[PDB]
Write a structure and sequence with these properties.
Chain A: May form a homodimer or a heterodimer with a related family member. Interacts with OLA1, TMA17, and UBR1. The structure is cut from a larger assembly and holds chains A (about 290 residues), B (about 90 residues), C (about 350 residues), D (about 260 residues) and E (about 350 residues). With about 290 residues, chain A is α/β, with parallel strands linked by helices. Chain A is about 40% helix and about 15% strand. In chain C, helix 6 packs parallel to helix 7 and helix 9 packs across helix 10. Classes of the chains: A alpha/beta (about 290), B mainly alpha (about 90), C alpha/beta (about 350), D alpha/beta (about 260), E alpha/beta (about 350).
Chain lengths: ~290, ~90, ~350, ~260, ~350
Amino acid sequence: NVKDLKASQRVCLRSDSYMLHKVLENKADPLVSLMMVEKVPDSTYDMVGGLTKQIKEIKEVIELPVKHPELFESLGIAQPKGVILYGPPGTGKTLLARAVAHHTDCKFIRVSGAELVQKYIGEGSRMVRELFVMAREHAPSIIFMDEIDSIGSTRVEGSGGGDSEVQRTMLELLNQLDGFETSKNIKIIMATNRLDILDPALLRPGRIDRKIEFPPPSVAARAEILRIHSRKMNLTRGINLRKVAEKMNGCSGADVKGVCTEAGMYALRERRIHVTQEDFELAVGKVMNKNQET
Amino acid sequence: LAYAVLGIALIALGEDIGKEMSLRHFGHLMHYGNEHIRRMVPLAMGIVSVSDPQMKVFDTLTRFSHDADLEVSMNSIFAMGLCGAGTNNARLA
Amino acid sequence: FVSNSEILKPFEKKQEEEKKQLEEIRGNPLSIGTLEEIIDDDHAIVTSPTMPDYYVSILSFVDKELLEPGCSVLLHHKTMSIVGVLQDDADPMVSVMKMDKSPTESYSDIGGLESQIQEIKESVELPLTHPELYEEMGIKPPKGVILYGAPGTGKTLLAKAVANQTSATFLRIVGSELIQKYLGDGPRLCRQIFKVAGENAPSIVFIDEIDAIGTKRYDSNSGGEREIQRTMLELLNQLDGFDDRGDVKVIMATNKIETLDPALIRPGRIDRKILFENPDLSTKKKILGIHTSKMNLSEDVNLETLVTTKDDLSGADIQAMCTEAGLLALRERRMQVTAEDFKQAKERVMKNKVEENLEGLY
Amino acid sequence: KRIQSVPLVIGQFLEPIDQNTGIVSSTTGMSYVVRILSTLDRELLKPSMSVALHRHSNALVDILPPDSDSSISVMGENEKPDVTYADVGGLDMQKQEIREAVELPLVQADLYEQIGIDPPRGVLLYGPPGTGKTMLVKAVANSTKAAFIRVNGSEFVHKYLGEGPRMVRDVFRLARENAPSIIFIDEVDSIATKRFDAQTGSDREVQRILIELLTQMDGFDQSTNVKVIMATNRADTLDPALLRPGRLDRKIEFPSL
Amino acid sequence: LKQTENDLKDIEARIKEKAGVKESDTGLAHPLQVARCTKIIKGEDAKYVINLKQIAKFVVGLGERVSPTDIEEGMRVGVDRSKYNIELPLPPRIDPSVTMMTVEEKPDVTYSDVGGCKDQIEKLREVVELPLLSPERFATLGIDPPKGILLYGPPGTGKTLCARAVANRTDATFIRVIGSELVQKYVGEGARMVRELFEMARTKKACIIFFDEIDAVGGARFDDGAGGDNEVQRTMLELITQLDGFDPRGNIKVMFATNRPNTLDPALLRPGRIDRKVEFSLPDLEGRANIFRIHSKSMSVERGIRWELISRLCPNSTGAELRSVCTEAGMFAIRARRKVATEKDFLKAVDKVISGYKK
């Protein structure tokens, strides 16, 4: 029947009779042009932990709206348009985005800004317009903009105004959502540690309303991050994570993940079936050596 | 029958949705044939659209003006003059 | 049933006869295609998407004076005869246009900016409302207008409000993103915009934050100067090329207008360059009044008191304040919003605007 | 039996829709919905596999070992490649670096997993090739006694829709089957230096080949017995999906000093 | 009514069409860029078999064929871009373009000014108007009328409006090519468009080809390429060649538009490219007055206007600015709700327009 058929349905039609005999599944094209879904993320607040100041702030800006929309409306506060995270590089800027997405149980959608840089008439323009349509179907979502961020957790990508032009479009679209629709279920995440990727629309109220600070790790914090990474794998059981942590100073969340992986090569050479505390001290010594560079 | 559809304007007094339902409704009337029905529709539309003006009703009536059915053109133009009343001229010019 | 059936059976009968006769000839699989051109030998050359192309006969479903090139038509198996005509598909306001159909806000909700509102009106709202002055006189209403102010503060508000009042599709273009940095992308993007707008008139081409093709150069060289200049020139030529009294209306937008050339504005089409003045005291009361409606608050709040100490502050400030005050209540685990909260939000925003020391505050 | 016999067209199975029915894409450009045999429907049925198709029948004739070919020239397999520790001595840092990254998961997947650290699945090598680097790569393959599959990475670069996606798919599959193995991507910078800033347009055809490589690369190698080694004329940046953890996790430098 | 008559037309059309399809089926079967009759059973050489394609070839040197009248077959048919040629079964038109441009037959904008553009109009009149009205005059003298005109000062000065107006009077086509769009970055594409525009131009002769902006394309050539002056010069140098290379003068007109005068090359200036330089730059006080007087005739007005006074407030203008003063003056009146225009309004519109133009 015609209500099984729909626009953009993929169907099997007889080459014999030209009769649409069954329906498969619907197809799409931006979802395979470097945009992607990642359901139920594996990041937690304990992952890049020691985020306390941020935790309460981020919960109210993102999580409460999503969890309870009616409440925001009636209270007298419209939902925040964007959050920009600003603080030291290489922390867990990306990680945080995924963590929040998981918590509310919303779809994490990773957008490569530049990819959204086709050199044909409009094909790029097309994908940008479709990015919003898709996410409106897929609501709720965290739309995380990759390539505006310098992080050692993944990689520093982006150059030029080629992700500043894209960064602008995201902010217009939030106006547009409060605008004719009068909805908002879709929150857009900036992360940056860089001044040569900003906008003047970024600096403007009614266009982006929250600037939430990302702390530096500390000796207490490093222990929390380290603890998670060592208990996703096999380790000695008398361990003092606190001891290790005091030895790292200066060292971001991404470094706490590097310490474990460098410690592991030591374990692996000496043909152990677990890592030990020892490996971790030596690993902290290795990272400190790099920071001090001549 | 002519009077039944005329009656529906008066029944649709004080009823918010129903005024909206008219726009669905006159759609139904186009499907149904018969000279009695073709004659009645400019009048049905005219009465509703001077106790609740409808841009859709004006848009339809312009087309009825240039109709090859004689009785329909007749009723459309008198009707159209009914909608433009309340002013001299407007879009009516 | 039976009452219906007596009118029904012949009314059914004339449509069915036409239909029958069509379907037999029209028998599937018939390829859909595009008319390339309609020829001097009364043929049409067609571009078939199956790769041949042909000189084709027409069966007058609707006539050739009612048919134009690039229209979609349905073509026979080999000779590609036009068996029936089709309606066009994939109109491209879903690819170069972000659409805001019947957008929100109005003139009453920011009122107190009333003198500027009449100005904007006179080019856009008013010709629709009263054609007659414009017609009789014989001079045209300005095609295009430029708004300068700031996003979420007054520029955007005026644009939502006016567009909705005229019931035209507000079609939002990102100026900077046109910005595509390779020789082929922009001038087409621009052409494709203007085309679709005029077709499906009256329509608003809203060009948001054009700052980057706001240069003019005396000489053009290379790709690095010429790209920019090609995009600028394309806007200028389309305006200069056609004239429209409101098949296409333009709102151009920029923060300040001192970054637009006066030879890109083009007097005599764009005659209005309309300013942004700050909300004054009456307006603040109003802007507030609208934003306090949506609220659940305490009765110790005095809308009046907070307006009076605010020194001539932007509509943005007023929005911001409400949004800020709700947060101070939400954190404290409550849904009531006391006066003290509004006041703290007011003190913070008022300081930042009024910071400009040793050259403003000498 | 005789009805379903040579000559034959080659296709690929995309997915099973329902019972006794499957979708294939044949290599020509014509896609068919076909039947599968009832004795091929259970216990030999993979969701994507290489198939033998009849050209009148429109039925599953045979299931093929995955190595179905392309109109691009075939890639090179070299069991025991002949460069095997030629240049040595004074490459002390680069020899040690390779050794713990590349050799150990092939001989023992199982120790990495038991520690619970991720094995390197992909490694990126940067610095010149053909001056001490290549020699080592080849030598490791030979010493671990894995097949060297030299895979021409600037040769996707075919100018047609997808022959090229079909070929990558065949190669990752065939590597896991013929484990231990090295897929060695000569110049990965050809099919993955694109859009970082809306420069390096004209790379729309490699975008499909890229997605296909990521789904095969990350979705296997969970314990690691098959290594991917990436090679670049000096260095080139890559599109963000390769570079993140779970793929190119070791990033190995050839010393300036 | 409207419905029965539409069906009656379908029925009639259709029967003729069904018969005609079957006849087309039995034989197993104008613009065109190669001919391609993909079979040819009917029809050096004494019979046609012509099919111009990479993948195969059928070649016959001899066209004509008044019986059967050739054509038919796998249909694209006529003259070839290789010159084997369907010569004269169903109208060829010399390699005729399938690549379009915007045609505006009779552009409608009649005579915006006729006073205060007095000399500039008169220049157009000699070159364009009179040679269509009488070709014999020109012939008898033995002169050939200016091939190309350059129009300077800013564009949209009412430069467009005037050009269009003479085109209406003569019933001639505006052929618009916009310089900026041509710009591709793919090998040879722009120059290819230029050749087909002139082939098409010769067919359509009595036409004003409007080339928008020479600041856009052909802006330099002193670089010796750069990637973005290299396609752009390629297009440009090709376009000149065509012009001195001959297209008919006194029919085909090319009109150039430019905002700024630093783009021009010695190649561009020369005859057979530009012959005329028409001003639309800065007019006189007497002149500004005439253009004001002219736009306000159509308008109602209430008394007390002297054009001279309005003119006085302009220290320098362009035609664009003048058009803005009358139209802006009308707007102050409509806000107050008025049909008439006043001396006060005109003054108010001068002050606004000039001051914005500054900087």
